[PDB]
Amino acid sequence: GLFKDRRVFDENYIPPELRVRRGEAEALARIYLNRLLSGAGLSDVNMIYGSIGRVGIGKTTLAKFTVKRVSEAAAKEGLTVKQAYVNAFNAPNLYTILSLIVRQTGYPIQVRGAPALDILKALVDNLYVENHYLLVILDEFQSMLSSPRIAAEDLYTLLRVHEEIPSRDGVNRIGFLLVASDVRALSYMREKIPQVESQIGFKLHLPAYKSRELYTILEQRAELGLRDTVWEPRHLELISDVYGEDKGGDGSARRAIVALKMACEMAEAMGRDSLSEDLVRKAVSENASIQTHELEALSIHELIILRLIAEATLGGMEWINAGLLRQRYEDASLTMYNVKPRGYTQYHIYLKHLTSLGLVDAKPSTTLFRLAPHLPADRLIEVVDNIIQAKMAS
Ligand SMILES: Nc1ncnc2c1ncn2[C@@H]1O[C@H](COP(=O)(O)OP(=O)(O)NP(=O)(O)O)[C@@H](O)[C@H]1O
Ligand SMILES: [Mg+2]
Incomplete structure (x- = not known):
């Protein structure tokens, strides 16, 4: 085909x-x-x-x-x-x-x-x-x-x-x-x-x-792997524009290539003999790694902070300031989790660690924090909640 x-x-x-x-x-x-x-x-x-x-x-x-x-x-x-x-x-x-x-x-x-x-x-x-x-x-x-x-x-x-x-x-x-x-x-x-x-x-x-690199990578897969009539540059741009790490994506070449694969098999399955933009866009939308063993390694208290940073993102207010985060953290531990909030010193170690794990970005002007844009915020909130429950029970 x-x-x-x-x-x-x-x-x-x-x-x-x-x-x-x-x-x-x-x-x-x-x-x-x-x-x-x-x-x-x-x-x-x-x-x-x-x-x-x-x-x-x-x-x-x-x-x-x-x-x-x-x-x-x-x-x-x-x-x-x-x-x-x-x-x-x-x-x-x-x-x-x-x-x-x-x-x-x-x-x-x-x-x-x-x-x-x-x-x-x-x-x-x-x-x-x-x-x-x-x-x-x-x-x-x-x-x-x-x-x-x-x-x-x-x-x-x-x-x-x-x-x-x-x-x-x-x-x-x-x-x-x-x-x-x-x-x-x-x-x-x-x-x-x-x-x-x-x-x-x-x-x-x-x-x-970056998207430009993904584009180069998809173009080489098309050339070697697809029949020459089947694809157009723009088809591939549709994938790279979404997955590029400069555009808020993964930057994963595996994910980009699998999308292009899928789009091609979606065309075949319909009887088409070329791609269309709909099929590519379709492929991108049915086609992201969250490694639970990484989260499971985290203490309840890191997990509570991660959760809070994630929900601030899900509600369209990407970037939360240190002050508010602390407030919500104290608020959240006691009421939602029935654990007493850890002191400032321990708190800052936790925030640092989240940052070094690449889960959260930190920027001054007094510190602003966000979930890593590539992380699916609701999938993560879900995962995180269950891990907190499991650690507490234990
Ligand atoms: N520079 C590149 N040129 C061409 N293909 C690439 C390039 N980088 C990655 N790929 C393809 O993208 C897919 C993912 O690449 P891979 O080398 O397995 O990444 P990885 O970092 O080892 N993945 P993971 O071990 O799951 O974190 C594979 O199909 C690669 O052949
Ligand atoms: Mg590998």
Whole structure:
């Protein structure tokens, strides 16, 4: 029907080129290549993280595209770099991370009963036998940090492998690209394991996408994925104008792409063979992440303040001043929640924390606060209320 290749719209499709974040991909690729193309092997550890609470902003895509580029460029010089991708949500312990990494190399290394260290040794040996290099992406890295099943000392040996496990010929052949959801992963590493954190040479922060970038991203999906007659620029603008973070949206490329997908299948299902504006607009309106586990981690008192900031937004008065907020907070704790209001000192810590979680923006002129514009205010009020109820009962 409308599609010339539907797989261009699947969640792990990686485009043959990047048109947004291209420079960041080159910079990352170059740090690896600089070490490798100068005969110093592969050993760098770098990280990609995103804005706090933002999803679908290219963390995974950038990391995989970059490694892909390192591999193409190294082959022009005849080198051989293998790629291994591990999502650390999908792996409780280092033993599991490691056996996933060997599965991907294809090397015949027996992992039954082998300690994490020993698997790493066999890996180092096979890379030496073969004359190969291995660039490892560890995605959702933050889950490797909040995991009692993985010990500080282990991450240490993993991320400092060439100091702990030297190769036969002294050629370092393993580098790392860590991908974490946000800066807290770094904050945590600094406070808990600064000897591993210090190994990270380059940290790259991915922000949410502006409308212009989303437009560029949708245009590349249309070109590769849609038949040329099916779409028009304006169709795509309709998506990017709403989702752009400069326009009050998510800035999520995942959401934008899924909208365009949906609009196309909505056309097919009707018997149309091109898009129309109605279908695109339709798609945008049936097509937003609120992570309850983040809220559940918050104390009742933060949750009460979050709620109040949210309702001030829902009633068309976006931006509430410190004074009124405090008043409503004292008012609200006692009457609505039957808890005594916390003192000023504790209160300010709570407001700060909400801000640092990106849930609320704060601006002076005496402080003004608002819900993050991209947050659905009534969905959040709902979620928040139930969490307060559950914490109290407990
Ligand atoms: N610069 C880009 N160029 C082309 N496609 C992109 C870009 N950034 C994101 N995408 C696409 O947008 C979708 C979401 O990207 P993804 O790399 O999975 O974001 P993410 O930050 O890892 N999402 P999440 O882990 O859920 O917070 C995927 O289909 C990507 O291929
Ligand atoms: Mg991801």
